[PDB]
Amino acid sequence: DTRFHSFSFYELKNVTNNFDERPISVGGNKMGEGGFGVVYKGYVNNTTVAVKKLAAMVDITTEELKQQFDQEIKVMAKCQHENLVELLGFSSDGDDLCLVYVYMPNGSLLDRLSCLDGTPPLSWHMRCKIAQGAANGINFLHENHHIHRDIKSANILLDEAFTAKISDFGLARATVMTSRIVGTTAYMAPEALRGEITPKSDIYSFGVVLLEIITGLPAVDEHREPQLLLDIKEEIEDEEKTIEDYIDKKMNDADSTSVEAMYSVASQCLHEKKNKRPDIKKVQQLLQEMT
């Protein structure tokens, strides 16, 4: 189990231009945000890093944010894999709790699918590699008895070779129930919205991610019919649509056979009955057979 480097809060402040909140495109250091903090670009010990300065951006407490900080370090100390983000160190000495990670040059899958800031669209070849890599990451977590609990495309990061790296382990748990229902509702399994804690919920959320990969559509869009991307499964099932109607137009290399194979995995992951969903090993196998 990994022992991590302790960074001085002031060194992190220095290397992020005092946690410069302007976007990196403008000339600032802000890379993005999530429900549990703001991520900044840093340059420490001769290397570009990602610095997450923790902050309750969702309806959670100071103590809950501290328990998630501790949980994230514990998960990162136990879990190292080609398809998981790597923690370099942390800071707990100064004004705010910080986590320092190996920099992900291509940001999140969510942003690459939306082509945020004008980045070029991901090819079908790249999308297949990403789906396989994300499934491999989840498989490693599940094999090592960890439940992610927050699988979403904003938490699947992309490195210098567009290798998928699962991130955000603050809610991870190493069938039981909870009184604090947490997560992004557009991705959550029905049993997760009720408070159940199970690896089968990670599978369902991964099915939503696969629909995002196929369609390039966000999981929720208030101004779209259906508002929830997971509802396209019923549209296709009740023959009012085909996956061809929803395929992202921003690729030139997709083929109907492998797109239908990825859709079939997603459809299976999205079974409303948790016990009827494939386990991650079956997901991995089906995605390997796809290519």
- Residues making up the annotated binding site for ATP are 31-39, 52, 152-155, 168
Does the annotation mark 96 as catalytic?
Answer: no
Quote the tokens at residue 36: 């549990």
Does the footprint of ligand QL7 cover residue 253 (CB under 6 A)? no
> What is the DSSP-derived secondary structure letter of residue 223?
T
| Max Cα distance, the chain (Å) | 59
Residue among 170 and 199 whose Cβ is closer to ligand QL7: 170
Cα–Cα distance list, 100 to 37, 48, 136, 212, 275 (Å): 12, 10, 23, 28, 38
Which residue in 150, 159, 202, 248 is the catalytic one? Answer: 150
Residue among 58 and 177 whose Cβ is closer to ligand QL7: 58
Does the footprint of ligand QL7 cover residue 137 (CB under 6 A)? no
Residue among 76 and 214 whose Cβ is closer to ligand QL7: 76
Which residue in 45, 67, 80, 119 binds ligand QL7 (CB under 6 A)?
A: 119
The least distance separating a copy of itself from the CB of residue 64, rounded to whole angstroms, comes to 30
Which residue in 7, 13, 15, 34 binds ligand QL7 (CB under 6 A)?
A: 34
Stretch that binds ligand QL7, among 3-11, 66-74, 103-111, 264-272 (CB under 6 A): 103-111
* Residue whose C-alpha is closest to residue 107's, from 94, 97, 99, 116: 116
Query: Residues 6 or more apart from 62 whose CB is under 8 A from it?
Result: 56
Q: Please give the backbone phi and psi of residue 132, each rounded to the nearest 5 degrees, phi first.
A: -60, -50
Query: Residues 6 or more apart from 41 whose CB is under 8 A from it?
Result: 16, 24, 29, 31, 48, 49, 50, 51, 103
Stretch that binds ligand QL7, among 107-115, 232-240, 261-269, 273-281 (CB under 6 A): 107-115
Which residue in 42, 107, 137, 170 binds ligand QL7 (CB under 6 A)?
A: 107
* Residue whose C-alpha is closest to residue 176's, from 201, 151, 140: 201
Binding partner at 192 among a copy of itself, ligand QL7, none, C-beta below 5 to 8 Å by kind = none
- DSSP codes, 114-171: HTGGGPPPPPHHHHHHHHHHHHHHHHHHHHTT-B-S---GGGEEE-TT--EEE---TT
Q: What residue type is assigned to position 38 of the chain? A: V
C-beta of residue 72 within 8 angstroms of C-beta of residue 39: no
Q: How many CA atoms lie within 13 A of 170 on its CB side?
A: 23
Residue among 140 and 169 whose Cβ is closer to a copy of itself: 140
Does the footprint of ligand QL7 cover residue 164 (CB under 6 A)? no
* Residue whose C-alpha is closest to residue 83's, from 154, 159, 30, 5: 159
Residue among 194 and 250 whose Cβ is closer to a copy of itself: 250
Binding site for a copy of itself (CB under 8 A): 25-27, 43, 45-48, 80-82, 88, 102, 105-106, 114-121, 123-125, 136, 140, 159-163, 222-225, 249-255, 257-258, 281, 285
Binding partner at 257 among a copy of itself, ligand QL7, none, C-beta below 5 to 8 Å by kind = a copy of itself
Interacting residues with ligand QL7 (CB under 6 A) = 24, 31-32, 34, 39, 50, 52, 85, 101, 103-104, 106-108, 111, 117, 119, 154, 157, 167-168
